[PDB]
Write an enzyme that holds these catalytic residues in place. Sequence first.
Site, PDB file in Angstrom:
ATOM      1  CE1 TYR A   1      36.525  10.726  12.831  1.00  0.00           C
ATOM      2  CE2 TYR A   1      35.460   9.656  10.965  1.00  0.00           C
ATOM      3  CZ  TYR A   1      35.523  10.659  11.892  1.00  0.00           C
ATOM      4  OH  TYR A   1      34.547  11.596  11.927  1.00  0.00           O
TER       5      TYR A   1
ATOM      6  CD1 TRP B   1      32.749   4.124   6.879  1.00  0.00           C
ATOM      7  CD2 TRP B   1      32.320   6.152   6.028  1.00  0.00           C
ATOM      8  NE1 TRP B   1      32.723   5.030   7.930  1.00  0.00           N
ATOM      9  CE2 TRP B   1      32.454   6.278   7.428  1.00  0.00           C
ATOM     10  CE3 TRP B   1      32.038   7.299   5.272  1.00  0.00           C
ATOM     11  CZ2 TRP B   1      32.316   7.502   8.084  1.00  0.00           C
ATOM     12  CZ3 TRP B   1      31.910   8.526   5.936  1.00  0.00           C
ATOM     13  CH2 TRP B   1      32.048   8.608   7.316  1.00  0.00           C
TER      14      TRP B   1
ATOM     15  CD  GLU C   1      32.414   3.857  11.576  1.00  0.00           C
ATOM     16  OE1 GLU C   1      31.909   4.053  12.709  1.00  0.00           O
ATOM     17  OE2 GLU C   1      32.332   4.698  10.646  1.00  0.00           O
TER      18      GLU C   1
ATOM     19  NE  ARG D   1      33.140  18.192  10.306  1.00  0.00           N
ATOM     20  CZ  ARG D   1      32.181  18.083   9.383  1.00  0.00           C
ATOM     21  NH1 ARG D   1      31.203  18.960   9.292  1.00  0.00           N
ATOM     22  NH2 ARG D   1      32.188  17.073   8.535  1.00  0.00           N
TER      23      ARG D   1
ATOM     24  CG  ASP E   1      21.788  12.928   9.572  1.00  0.00           C
ATOM     25  OD1 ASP E   1      20.695  12.917  10.137  1.00  0.00           O
ATOM     26  OD2 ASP E   1      21.947  12.515   8.410  1.00  0.00           O
TER      27      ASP E   1
ATOM     28  CB  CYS F   1      31.049  14.018  11.645  1.00  0.00           C
ATOM     29  SG  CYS F   1      30.374  14.287  10.004  1.00  0.00           S
TER      30      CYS F   1
HETATM   31  C1  LIG Z   1      24.172  13.231   5.588  1.00  0.00           C
HETATM   32  C2  LIG Z   1      24.897  12.070   6.217  1.00  0.00           C
HETATM   33  N1  LIG Z   1      24.495  11.722   7.441  1.00  0.00           N
HETATM   34  C3  LIG Z   1      25.046  10.756   8.178  1.00  0.00           C
HETATM   35  O1  LIG Z   1      24.639  10.488   9.333  1.00  0.00           O
HETATM   36  C4  LIG Z   1      26.124   9.985   7.563  1.00  0.00           C
HETATM   37  C5  LIG Z   1      26.760   8.927   8.177  1.00  0.00           C
HETATM   38  C6  LIG Z   1      27.763   8.234   7.498  1.00  0.00           C
HETATM   39  C7  LIG Z   1      28.494   7.060   8.105  1.00  0.00           C
HETATM   40  N2  LIG Z   1      27.791   6.492   9.252  1.00  0.00           N
HETATM   41  C8  LIG Z   1      28.457   6.698  10.536  1.00  0.00           C
HETATM   42  C9  LIG Z   1      26.593   5.833   9.156  1.00  0.00           C
HETATM   43  C10 LIG Z   1      25.853   5.202  10.185  1.00  0.00           C
HETATM   44  C11 LIG Z   1      24.678   4.634   9.756  1.00  0.00           C
HETATM   45  C12 LIG Z   1      24.455   4.798   8.395  1.00  0.00           C
HETATM   46  C13 LIG Z   1      23.304   4.312   7.580  1.00  0.00           C
HETATM   47  O2  LIG Z   1      23.349   4.415   6.369  1.00  0.00           O
HETATM   48  N3  LIG Z   1      22.289   3.745   8.254  1.00  0.00           N
HETATM   49  C14 LIG Z   1      21.194   3.020   7.633  1.00  0.00           C
HETATM   50  C15 LIG Z   1      20.677   1.981   8.626  1.00  0.00           C
HETATM   51  C16 LIG Z   1      21.773   1.037   9.122  1.00  0.00           C
HETATM   52  C17 LIG Z   1      22.181   0.053   8.049  1.00  0.00           C
HETATM   53  O3  LIG Z   1      22.943   0.445   7.134  1.00  0.00           O
HETATM   54  O4  LIG Z   1      21.746  -1.119   8.119  1.00  0.00           O
HETATM   55  C18 LIG Z   1      20.074   3.918   7.190  1.00  0.00           C
HETATM   56  O5  LIG Z   1      19.265   4.359   8.042  1.00  0.00           O
HETATM   57  O6  LIG Z   1      19.998   4.196   5.971  1.00  0.00           O
HETATM   58  S1  LIG Z   1      25.761   5.677   7.659  1.00  0.00           S
HETATM   59  C19 LIG Z   1      28.165   8.638   6.226  1.00  0.00           C
HETATM   60  C20 LIG Z   1      27.548   9.704   5.585  1.00  0.00           C
HETATM   61  C21 LIG Z   1      26.525  10.393   6.207  1.00  0.00           C
HETATM   62  N4  LIG Z   1      25.899  11.424   5.579  1.00  0.00           N
HETATM   63  O1  LIG Z   2      29.437   9.725  11.513  1.00  0.00           O
HETATM   64  C1  LIG Z   2      28.889  10.682  10.951  1.00  0.00           C
HETATM   65  C2  LIG Z   2      29.206  11.175   9.643  1.00  0.00           C
HETATM   66  C3  LIG Z   2      28.478  12.173   9.121  1.00  0.00           C
HETATM   67  N1  LIG Z   2      27.418  12.746   9.805  1.00  0.00           N
HETATM   68  C4  LIG Z   2      26.499  13.657   9.125  1.00  0.00           C
HETATM   69  C5  LIG Z   2      26.567  15.112   9.579  1.00  0.00           C
HETATM   70  C6  LIG Z   2      26.163  15.839   8.300  1.00  0.00           C
HETATM   71  O2  LIG Z   2      24.752  15.751   8.124  1.00  0.00           O
HETATM   72  C7  LIG Z   2      26.880  15.006   7.243  1.00  0.00           C
HETATM   73  C8  LIG Z   2      28.292  15.437   6.964  1.00  0.00           C
HETATM   74  O3  LIG Z   2      28.182  16.651   6.198  1.00  0.00           O
HETATM   75  P1  LIG Z   2      29.054  17.919   6.487  1.00  0.00           P
HETATM   76  O4  LIG Z   2      28.686  18.358   7.932  1.00  0.00           O
HETATM   77  O5  LIG Z   2      30.481  17.569   6.348  1.00  0.00           O
HETATM   78  O6  LIG Z   2      28.573  18.929   5.462  1.00  0.00           O
HETATM   79  O7  LIG Z   2      26.857  13.653   7.759  1.00  0.00           O
HETATM   80  C9  LIG Z   2      27.085  12.331  11.076  1.00  0.00           C
HETATM   81  O8  LIG Z   2      26.129  12.783  11.688  1.00  0.00           O
HETATM   82  N2  LIG Z   2      27.860  11.328  11.581  1.00  0.00           N
END
Ligand SMILES: Cc1nc(=O)c2cc(CN(C)c3ccc(C(=O)N[C@@H](CCC(=O)O)C(=O)O)s3)ccc2[nH]1
Ligand SMILES: O=c1ccn([C@H]2C[C@H](O)[C@@H](COP(=O)(O)O)O2)c(=O)[nH]1
Lengths: 278, 286
Positions: free
Chosen positions: B109, B83, B61, B189, B192, B169
């Site tokens: 980004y 994504w 990424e 900002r 999660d 974020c």
């Molecule tokens: C609510 C929300 N929280 C997030 O942390 C988040 C992160 C991303 C992008 N991102 C930066 C991510 C990092 C890791 C991810 C994930 O889906 N992890 C898997 C485990 C890793 C894998 O895919 O093998 C999981 O735990 O479901 S997604 C996109 C939308 C989001 N939406």
């Molecule tokens: O790399 C990332 C992308 C997203 N988020 C989490 C934060 C929020 O739970 C959600 C984005 O939602 P909003 O804060 O935009 O509502 O995904 C992360 O922690 N890290």
Amino acid sequence: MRHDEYQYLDLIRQIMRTGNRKGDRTGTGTISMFGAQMRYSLRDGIFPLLTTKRVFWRGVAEELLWFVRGSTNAKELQEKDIHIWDGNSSREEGDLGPVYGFQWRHFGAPYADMHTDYTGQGVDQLQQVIDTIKNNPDDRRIIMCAWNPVDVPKMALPPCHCLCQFYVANGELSCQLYQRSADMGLGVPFNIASYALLTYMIAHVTDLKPGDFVHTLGDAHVYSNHCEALEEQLKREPRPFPSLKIKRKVENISDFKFEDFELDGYKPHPKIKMEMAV
Amino acid sequence: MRHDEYQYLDLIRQIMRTGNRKGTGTGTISMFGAQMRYSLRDGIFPLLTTKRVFWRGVAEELLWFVRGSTNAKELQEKDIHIWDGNSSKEFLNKMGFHDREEGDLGPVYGFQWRHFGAPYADMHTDYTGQGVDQLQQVIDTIKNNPDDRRIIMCAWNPVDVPKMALPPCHCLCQFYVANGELSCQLYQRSADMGLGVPFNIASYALLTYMIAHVTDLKPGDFVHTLGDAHVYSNHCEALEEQLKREPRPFPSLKIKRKVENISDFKFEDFELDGYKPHPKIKMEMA
Ligand SMILES: Cc1nc(=O)c2cc(CN(C)c3ccc(C(=O)N[C@@H](CCC(=O)O)C(=O)O)s3)ccc2[nH]1
Ligand SMILES: O=c1ccn([C@H]2C[C@H](O)[C@@H](COP(=O)(O)O)O2)c(=O)[nH]1
Ligand SMILES: Cc1nc(=O)c2cc(CN(C)c3ccc(C(=O)N[C@@H](CCC(=O)O)C(=O)O)s3)ccc2[nH]1
Ligand SMILES: O=c1ccn([C@H]2C[C@H](O)[C@@H](COP(=O)(O)O)O2)c(=O)[nH]1
């Protein structure tokens, strides 16, 4: 129950005792740390105007009202005996370029000069924040950003206050500031008060109570020639913060006037002389 | 000296205990304002160990960001699906992006880092020479004026947020040089804590390793500042299990050859040694 101002004093002490000595843009030399965070309660009328050295309250309030008007004209502050933007402003005398007032009210618009009518141009981030607080307070994007990579080269000085974010819980409005560059001696006390006051103003017009001001620092530094003065300041015990009340129901963020603020009980230790680096 | 991973564990613990319960439809438990510091020195790489993190996803990424790409299909081709949720044609149509193709995340980004201020058209457009290349600007300032207090890369673009599949974020990061060491602070900002934060720590630690390498500096610290730091309510059981696990020593990271420009890294250039995590714990994404 430890006085919140000790966070500031502790950081100055840590910087002078453990910080990195370096050169800097101004040529004065600094002692610095990278990455810090303070939290100031704003609750129950408490206003965190620092007390171990008198802070420039009138400058804080007039500068912020000027930001809120969207002004970039330092002559409007000079006319009020506020000279904090003088060093960087003599393009016409007084025209600071696309600084805070313009970014807060017109982010993304092309800048011409301080007299240009920018109505309807760019993003009015300040009204956007107010609307989101009122309509969707749990939103995690309640941000006002002054750091504009396109415009920084046109600015008289790049913003130290890159962005701030708001948060709502428990009937309370909180604010976090990201400050990339923090002169602990001179600017930081003023900067705390600026964003605490902005939070009081936005809380007032959104029918919320102030909560916390969270102050995050990037390059947090003491100028080398400030150490003697700051060693004297560190001998002083904070006094209870003043209180701040807003004397009438102000309907909208643009309607505030200086006389609307009632700052009660500000009893700082005397000013300490500290030359500002250039 | 306590293991740096305890900062993350302690913050999860604190949020679940005293955080604010608020309202997607999933509940959040949240605090406002937090800050962690991870040493990057002496080859140490802060890839969290109390739950196996997706290292190859982190690195690919980040290389994708550095290319300026906003096309999620390029991650899918490498079996990185982080994504996918935010770039299906259905999701995009739902968000009002009716003329946007599958995979096109909008001006996120890669585009803000390399082309801030340029008009966004689509993910295939040639943006060479358009907008501000903030990433190269940071590298040049580190090389030429390391004491500068404006070494900033900002992805938060108020003009463009309405076009983004998700507002960033990771609002901005700042770099700092002292004693031959490069540090990085991230303002995030929205955090999660269960799902995104471990990955996000590893991303900006890796970025710092890459920039340090090409500027002939050593990594120093990663400072992670959070705005709305939250635990989704349905993560609490899983995170309660993670909190009983002891961190193991972090892995080490080496770059296997001399890389001249930030754009020249490939995944195989990284040697991650000694990563011995506890197993993954399922946490469903809100
Ligand atoms: C609510 C929300 N929280 C997030 O942390 C988040 C992160 C991303 C992008 N991102 C930066 C991510 C990092 C890791 C991810 C994930 O889906 N992890 C898997 C485990 C890793 C894998 O895919 O093998 C999981 O735990 O479901 S997604 C996109 C939308 C989001 N939406
Ligand atoms: O790399 C990332 C992308 C997203 N988020 C989490 C934060 C929020 O739970 C959600 C984005 O939602 P909003 O804060 O935009 O509502 O995904 C992360 O922690 N890290
Ligand atoms: C090196 C440097 N450090 C700063 O803190 C700084 C701050 C500003 C703007 N600013 C945010 C200021 C706040 C307060 C100020 C000031 O000069 N105050 C003095 C005297 C009070 C007065 O001006 O009447 C003081 O109170 O110490 S200036 C501009 C350039 C700077 N330059
Ligand atoms: O509101 C302000 C404005 C400026 N500064 C200080 C930080 C630096 O010491 C100097 C600005 O210099 P650069 O970071 O831009 O070099 O003024 C503050 O602390 N607060």
